Amino acid sequence: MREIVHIQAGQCGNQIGAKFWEVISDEHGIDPSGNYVGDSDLQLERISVYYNEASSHKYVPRAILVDLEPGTMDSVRSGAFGHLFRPDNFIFGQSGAGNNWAKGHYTEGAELVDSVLDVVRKECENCDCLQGFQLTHSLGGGTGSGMGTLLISKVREEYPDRIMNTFSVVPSPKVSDTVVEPYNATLSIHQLVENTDETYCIDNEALYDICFRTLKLATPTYGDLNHLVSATMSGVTTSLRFPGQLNADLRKLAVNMVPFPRLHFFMPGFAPLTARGSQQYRALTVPELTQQMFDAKNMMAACDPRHGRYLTVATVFRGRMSMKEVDEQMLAIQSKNSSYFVEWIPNNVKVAVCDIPPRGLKMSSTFIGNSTAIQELFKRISEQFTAMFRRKAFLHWYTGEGMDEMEFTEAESNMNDLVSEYQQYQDAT
Amino acid sequence: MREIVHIQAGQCGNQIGAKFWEVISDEHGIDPSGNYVGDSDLQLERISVYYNEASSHKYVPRAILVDLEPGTMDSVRSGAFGHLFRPDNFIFGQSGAGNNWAKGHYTEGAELVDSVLDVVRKECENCDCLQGFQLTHSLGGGTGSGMGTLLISKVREEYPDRIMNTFSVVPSPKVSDTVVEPYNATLSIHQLVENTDETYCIDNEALYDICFRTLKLATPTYGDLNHLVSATMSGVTTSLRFPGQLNADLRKLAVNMVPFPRLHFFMPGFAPLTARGSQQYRALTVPELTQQMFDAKNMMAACDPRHGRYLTVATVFRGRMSMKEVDEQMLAIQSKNSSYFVEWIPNNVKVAVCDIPPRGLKMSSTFIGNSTAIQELFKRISEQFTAMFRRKAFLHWYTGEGMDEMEFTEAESNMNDLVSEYQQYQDAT
Amino acid sequence: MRECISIHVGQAGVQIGNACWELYCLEHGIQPDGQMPDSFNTFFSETGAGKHVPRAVFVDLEPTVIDEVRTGTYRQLFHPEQLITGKEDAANNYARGHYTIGKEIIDLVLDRIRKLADQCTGLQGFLVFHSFGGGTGSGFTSLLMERLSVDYGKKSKLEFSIYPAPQVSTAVVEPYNSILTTHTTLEHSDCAFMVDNEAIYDICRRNLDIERPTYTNLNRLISQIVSSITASLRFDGALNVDLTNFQTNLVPYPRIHFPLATYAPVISAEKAYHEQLSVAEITNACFEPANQMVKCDPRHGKYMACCLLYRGDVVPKDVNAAIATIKTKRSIQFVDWCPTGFKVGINYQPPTVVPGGDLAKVQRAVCMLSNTTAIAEAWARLDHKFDLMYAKRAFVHWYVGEGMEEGEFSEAREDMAALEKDYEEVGVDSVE
Amino acid sequence: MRECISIHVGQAGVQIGNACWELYCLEHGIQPDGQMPDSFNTFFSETGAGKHVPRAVFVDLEPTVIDEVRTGTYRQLFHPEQLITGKEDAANNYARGHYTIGKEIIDLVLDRIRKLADQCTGLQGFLVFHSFGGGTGSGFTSLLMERLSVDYGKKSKLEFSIYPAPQVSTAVVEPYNSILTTHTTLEHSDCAFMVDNEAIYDICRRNLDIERPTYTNLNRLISQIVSSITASLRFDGALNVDLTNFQTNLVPYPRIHFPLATYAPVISAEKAYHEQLSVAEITNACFEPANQMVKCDPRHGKYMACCLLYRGDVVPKDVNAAIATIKTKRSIQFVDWCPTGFKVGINYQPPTVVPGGDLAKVQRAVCMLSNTTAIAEAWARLDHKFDLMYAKRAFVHWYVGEGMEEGEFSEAREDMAALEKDYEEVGVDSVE
Numbered sequence A, B: 001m002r003e004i005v006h007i008q009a010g011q012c013g014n015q016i017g018a019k020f021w022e023v024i025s026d027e028h029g030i031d032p033s034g035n036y037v038g039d040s041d042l043q044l045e046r047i048s049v050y051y052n053e054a055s056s057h058k059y060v061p062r063a064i065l066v067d068l069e070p071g072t073m074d075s076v077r078s079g080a081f082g083h084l085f086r087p088d089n090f091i092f093g094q095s096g097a098g099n100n101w102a103k104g105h106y107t108e109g110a111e112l113v114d115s116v117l118d119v120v121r122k123e124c125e126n127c128d129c130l131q132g133f134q135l136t137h138s139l140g141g142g143t144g145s146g147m148g149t150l151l152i153s154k155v156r157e158e159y160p161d162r163i164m165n166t167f168s169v170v171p172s173p174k175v176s177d178t179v180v181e182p183y184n185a186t187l188s189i190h191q192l193v194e195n196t197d198e199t200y201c202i203d204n205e206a207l208y209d210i211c212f213r214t215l216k217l218a219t220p221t222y223g224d225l226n227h228l229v230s231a232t233m234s235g236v237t238t239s240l241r242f243p244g245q246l247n248a249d250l251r252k253l254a255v256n257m258v259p260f261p262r263l264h265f266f267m268p269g270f271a272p273l274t275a276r277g278s279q280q281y282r283a284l285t286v287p288e289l290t291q292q293m294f295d296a297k298n299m300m301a302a303c304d305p306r307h308g309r310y311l312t313v314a315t316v317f318r319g320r321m322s323m324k325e326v327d328e329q330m331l332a333i334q335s336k337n338s339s340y341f342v343e344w345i346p347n348n349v350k351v352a353v354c355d356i357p358p359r360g361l362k363m364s365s366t367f368i369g370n371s372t373a374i375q376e377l378f379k380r381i382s383e384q385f386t387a388m389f390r391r392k393a394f395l396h397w398y399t400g401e402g403m404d405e406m407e408f409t410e411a412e413s414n415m416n417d418l419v420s421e422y423q424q425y426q427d428a429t
Numbered sequence C, D: 001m002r003e004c005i006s007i008h009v010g011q012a013g014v015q016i017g018n019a020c021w022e023l024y025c026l027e028h029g030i031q032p033d034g035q036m037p038d039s040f041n042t043f044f045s046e047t048g049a050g051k052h053v054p055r056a057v058f059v060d061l062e063p064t065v066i067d068e069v070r071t072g073t074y075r076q077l078f079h080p081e082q083l084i085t086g087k088e089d090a091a092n093n094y095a096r097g098h099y100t101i102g103k104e105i106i107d108l109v110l111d112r113i114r115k116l117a118d119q120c121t122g123l124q125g126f127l128v129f130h131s132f133g134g135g136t137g138s139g140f141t142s143l144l145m146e147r148l149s150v151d152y153g154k155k156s157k158l159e160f161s162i163y164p165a166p167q168v169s170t171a172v173v174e175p176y177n178s179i180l181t182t183h184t185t186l187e188h189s190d191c192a193f194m195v196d197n198e199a200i201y202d203i204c205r206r207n208l209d210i211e212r213p214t215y216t217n218l219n220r221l222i223s224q225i226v227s228s229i230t231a232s233l234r235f236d237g238a239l240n241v242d243l244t245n246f247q248t249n250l251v252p253y254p255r256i257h258f259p260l261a262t263y264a265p266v267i268s269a270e271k272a273y274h275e276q277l278s279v280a281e282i283t284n285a286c287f288e289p290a291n292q293m294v295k296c297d298p299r300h301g302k303y304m305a306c307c308l309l310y311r312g313d314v315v316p317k318d319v320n321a322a323i324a325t326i327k328t329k330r331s332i333q334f335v336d337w338c339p340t341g342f343k344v345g346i347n348y349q350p351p352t353v354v355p356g357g358d359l360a361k362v363q364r365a366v367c368m369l370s371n372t373t374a375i376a377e378a379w380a381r382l383d384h385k386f387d388l389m390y391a392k393r394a395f396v397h398w399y400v401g402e403g404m405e406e407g408e409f410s411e412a413r414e415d416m417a418a419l420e421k422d423y424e425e426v427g428v429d430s431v432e
């Protein structure tokens, strides 16, 4: 029960989903042909939450892959771990938005939204009990942002009761892969604060930093970053698919991490992170993982938490451990970081423990921080957009695709309102 | 408990630490791979004070190796007994101070001090109870003196309660390996008398004398001197890692040897010292070791104690023996050297006995003398500096690296004050 | 699924197309007989047999060049349907190629274009190759581009225009042709690529050590540029890019769409070794003004937008590091109101050396498309020349007798001045 | 991680570099083709293949010498990028090489320098090799050193200047070139090494028993000196030393940075036996004035600073004993205000014999760098010559017509007098 439907938009979303479903299949011991050959009944007891068992004991991922270009879908169908997908799921157009949010939300999206919603409704009726949706996309490409916003709007208009998760790759401050990404980022963020339950902002800057420094890799490819994000997601949901002395679900996290409906943006963090040689030079201690999770260099969002305060903190542990040890860690870390938390929330740590490790290691930990520093990030983006809107550069594309300047005005206004709210609540005593 | 964190600065410090950790591993029967294959539970009961046990029963040295040049670290990683080190510990820059104390304390040190302090704090939190720090470095090279002073300053500003040990290779009077070492020696000594608990002045002159004459070796290499100093250090700390009929720790020594906070500079001495042929021509008697420890030719500091008086004397013995015999030795030697001790301190001998010998022999002894003759040494250095400051030769390097002449003036003033205090307290009745 | 068609006007266009289709055949392993002893679907259609034909269109008024193409090695490859020929060339007279002679076959060319379009489903855009000096070039380009823009409302349209060199000229009336054709194409061209023969001469002589280069080598270089531009469509990459992405990322304002192209690496075969060809190295080679293919030093202007297409085994991390370092430099300055002026594309297919060529095979290559304000200066020079040759009303009588008005010259000059003014005005910074 | 680049001006510089890079290749086991059938990272960069290239720069105005290098055995090793050539040599005219001709390629040399610097990360310093007699030497050295010091604020800069012999001259206007280039380099050179041909002639004739030595042998000796200087960086030792250590230990005052070099042992192959080559023995050989490579007897001055680099299997104890004994001597006298004038460095790598050479392989070698006050006397002699050749205003008209002022000569002479005065004044003892 409590099945979760996976949706992927944007090229980055598709690559992340490919690696993520690879990870999931490996965890449940599912071959690329889709047949289970594992040895632990635990995997099969909750396999339904992510898979569907077709006859002859075949298993298919409950996933949807969406784009507007055939290249990425063709690549996915080409490589291994692509056969198990239902071949009818690959919805794709022919043009590709081309970093034009208006195209990805007005013209092209209006063509494939019908098929997307049809497949979504089919999947919804196919499952027993719907828990929520998790979305994968970008915020720079027009495809990702535009179509993701459109689908989120339609779905929320169709399911006001379900919980919605989004893993949006926020563009990095220093490095920008595009030229016009501030516009679409602003519009997509507007729609997200409109109709989303939680957003896991992630930057390629922070991921590159972690891969280069912590993992000691001079050549980080997209595969490595996608693998990291996949591990993060699997750690997030594993409290559902496995027993634990203190389990959590998406609803519990949503209640714990969202004090007020607007402030629902998080940052993730994973531990441990060890190189190929630097692994047997350390004891795997709950204190070690705890201290690894809390530091500037290990945050997947390019924003120093020291510049702000933590509104809420959640932690999910995997592998056997004693609760008392974790409790001691939490109390010690809250004692030493007394200046790093909001005062009006006592005991702002939400703990949860599973009983299965991330295959190959003895224990692991995932940290989800809802802090206030992230607003700084937003600030910068607005400034970028601000400059790029003062001269109205590149405006004519969106203008001729139906959008108007009032749209950008309202989007910037809403973003500034959100930043003001975040700053004000940081200053709350 | 009472774990001790080892820090090494300077090329000499790194070589000494390499040999010293080799000695420690041999004593505890630890293979270069880091696994214990010994046969005495005594080694394992206190192994934590110097090692950390990572999983799969591996042991890593709780050491930090610091420099600004990659050559020495590369050499350490190359040779055996280097694998067991945690590969993340090797903090090193790219330039090397180059006998410029200003560079090693203002420009280069400011770049790596962050990483050094981070690793130090990590190690501190990793251990249960911190006893103190022992430092290894030089006083001639800019790297050693400058970065050691910087690290000592920062650490003491972070831990006013812990005890600090330094093993500073003081430049020899006759032989000088550099041209400008008086300046950095003066500055480093200033900072040491500022923020150190005990300093074990050692000279290559005295070590060469001992190796050539006593050990009867015509070709003493740096390896031999480093091995001697390593044996001295292990003998100093072995009263902590092993039981003994009368044990001592760093705190006891600090209390015993420091009558006044400024006068905290010692000289070491080791016994026995026998050649390869001259070993079975002597009985290993407590009187023999005692008389060997007390003579001009066997002092690792180039200063005749006869020219001064012993403020305090400490002695640490290893191997089984009777207390009464040692007591008789102490009383006899104090009787015959009545003119060699301060009058206002009766019973100025601090005895301690362990119960494990230093691998291969039956007994051994280490002597720690806090005397007054050492001031003479300082005198000479000042004179050197004096001459080299009269013409302000080589001053322009430090001047253009931010330092000013007032710094040298204050340093010489402070050194002269220290020498005056030492001489005055020698004359105290 | 994603098709893009080619048009070649004048001898320059035809030779450039010869080089281009030669290169494409070498890429997809295509024999001169359409056999290959999907990828090619973009540019090649397939007959019932295993033979493929290129979606190409050749047009000229002098039949000599087309006859050479027919008698060339690539005879069997082309479809003799498209090799349109005339009778008398425009003869460096825009009036002939835009009012008198071009009318004779404009309908035929349009018909062939429409027939090719109807058999394609993923029509992307048009690659027009044509010089400016030749009257065929200017006149037929103006006519055909007007017709196509009239027909198809919004589809990609790319030109590779051989801008006349500042000093090294071949014709005499080049300013007239250039001014007229630029005034025309300013309203229809989605994105045009300026290329000059003098810059390529300099590049080949200095960097490839070829003291006496022929037109063949310049055609090789331009074919390399085009292949690198389309490699994102024709293949897969870690980060692909389409033409619509280019037009969205390089056109801040509807009129300013005149970038220039640069390519790297370019080293002689004997110099294949003696350097490791870093991604940072090739980045520096690209951004060095001595390698830009238009006679304008960018240090006199600001890069309004830049795009980099890498092909071969590249890694985005080091690419991003090199780009960030480039941004930290001073002389490479952009507009204040643009915070980031870089677009990045990556393809897994390395370029392939042309057999019998002059370059050396590499594992990584990079094409740069830069839309800056320095190029504006170039226009002024031409106007200068035009003004002199228009002050005395020289050569006007040919055009007058061919059905053209002096007011057309005046209005074209005015429009050129307006464009230059817009370029300079955008070149300024913003208030507060 | 620790890189240092080379520059060679004039024929002397080029030949010295030939010898030097020959020696380095022999050291790291490098074929003339960059293969080696880390250590080399300091001087050699590595291409994609197993081929390595030397971070070298060759510059001259006469193309004959560079052509000889290209046609020499070490053809494939170098990168033809750096072999910069001119058209007409400066012709022993500092004005030509510093105002007229050097401007033609100074930009090119600077560009190559910057490109090499950008691909290096542990840039240590510059090794400039150039004579003084040749106008190319003086002029281009002045120009290039000024440019580099302008560019990079504080980085190591080393010169190996071929000081003109006291009596054995080759040109006629050597005093002019020497005075001008010394006045220039006094402000930019971090540390310059005086070397004279006459001293090396004497050393080769007497000690190596070669009655008729060629320039090749002198180049071999200087290459040995340079290799021993850098062996501390290029390898590990019981006590290594860097160039910054040298400049800190040998420069008591900002102007006095003109040491001289000496090498040992130097014995004929037939005399390889008949002596055990003690560390004390080689120490005495070094300190013997008959082996110093500049025509100045140190007994007329005081050693202000001395540095000894030993390589091979050495032991610091006996080294220190030998040095202490040396200090006990009388004629070897230093300044009163300097208590200790010795720096010591040790390397484990013994030098390797040059195949086809004249020396014999040893297991221990020692290079000495001495900054004394005797060398001051040398300057006076040149001034002497200059004064005479300037009293009659001889040869001035060439420089005048090339864009130089007599006031430049006067001011250079004044600066030389000032430097000599400073040397002598420091040579005195201190009060009380």
Ligand SMILES: Nc1nc2c(ncn2[C@@H]2O[C@H](COP(=O)(O)OP(=O)(O)OP(=O)(O)O)[C@@H](O)[C@H]2O)c(=O)[nH]1
Binding pocket: A009, A010, A011, A012, A013, A015, A067, A068, A096, A097, A098, A099, A100, A137, A138, A139, A140, A141, A142, A143, A144, A145, A169, A177, A178, A204, A222, A223, A225, A226, C238, C239, C245
């Ligand atoms: N973290 C991560 N991000 C990626 C990866 N690959 C691409 N991205 C980001 O995702 C964006 C890709 O653009 P999309 O959102 O997919 O847009 P599109 O599908 O190409 O369609 P158009 O917007 O019309 O171009 C880029 O801006 C990258 O910043 C990846 O492997 N990992």
Ligand SMILES: Nc1nc2c(ncn2[C@@H]2O[C@H](COP(=O)(O)OP(=O)(O)OP(=O)(O)O)[C@@H](O)[C@H]2O)c(=O)[nH]1
Binding pocket: B009, B010, B011, B012, B013, B015, B067, B068, B096, B097, B098, B099, B100, B137, B138, B139, B140, B141, B142, B143, B144, B145, B169, B177, B178, B204, B222, B223, B225, B226, D238, D239, D245
């Ligand atoms: N006792 C002993 N002393 C040594 C040994 N090796 C070197 N030394 C001393 O240590 C000093 C080495 O200089 P460092 O302090 O390491 O300075 P550095 O790391 O080289 O950096 P720079 O000061 O910039 O050169 C020398 O002056 C020697 O006197 C050794 O093996 N044993």
Ligand SMILES: Nc1nc2c(ncn2[C@@H]2O[C@H](COP(=O)(O)OP(=O)(O)OP(=O)(O)O)[C@@H](O)[C@H]2O)c(=O)[nH]1
Binding pocket: C009, C010, C011, C012, C013, C015, C060, C061, C062, C089, C090, C091, C092, C093, C130, C131, C132, C133, C134, C135, C136, C137, C138, C162, C170, C171, C197, C215, C216, C218, C219
């Ligand atoms: N890049 C490049 N340009 C060329 C080449 N050959 C000729 N050109 C340019 O193209 C122009 C050729 O004139 P065309 O445009 O073909 O004019 P046409 O076809 O002869 O017709 P008329 O204008 O009536 O003479 C010349 O001005 C050259 O500058 C070439 O091989 N490569």
Ligand SMILES: Nc1nc2c(ncn2[C@@H]2O[C@H](COP(=O)(O)OP(=O)(O)OP(=O)(O)O)[C@@H](O)[C@H]2O)c(=O)[nH]1
Binding pocket: D009, D010, D011, D012, D013, D015, D060, D061, D062, D089, D090, D091, D092, D093, D130, D131, D132, D133, D134, D135, D136, D137, D138, D162, D170, D171, D197, D215, D216, D218, D219
């Ligand atoms: N050590 C050494 N010195 C040399 C050698 N060959 C020439 N020299 C010196 O270098 C000088 C050569 O002149 P350059 O500096 O090369 O001047 P140039 O390159 O000929 O240019 P012009 O000054 O215009 O003639 C001569 O004065 C010699 O004293 C050599 O093989 N070894």
Ligand SMILES: [Mg+2]
Binding pocket: A011, A069, A096, A097, A098, A099, A141, A143
């Ligand atoms: Mg796309």
Ligand SMILES: [Mg+2]
Binding pocket: B011, B069, B096, B097, B098, B099, B141, B143
């Ligand atoms: Mg050093």
Ligand SMILES: [Mg+2]
Binding pocket: C062, C089, C090, C091, C092, C134, C136
């Ligand atoms: Mg023609």
Ligand SMILES: [Mg+2]
Binding pocket: D062, D089, D090, D091, D092, D134, D136
């Ligand atoms: Mg010459």
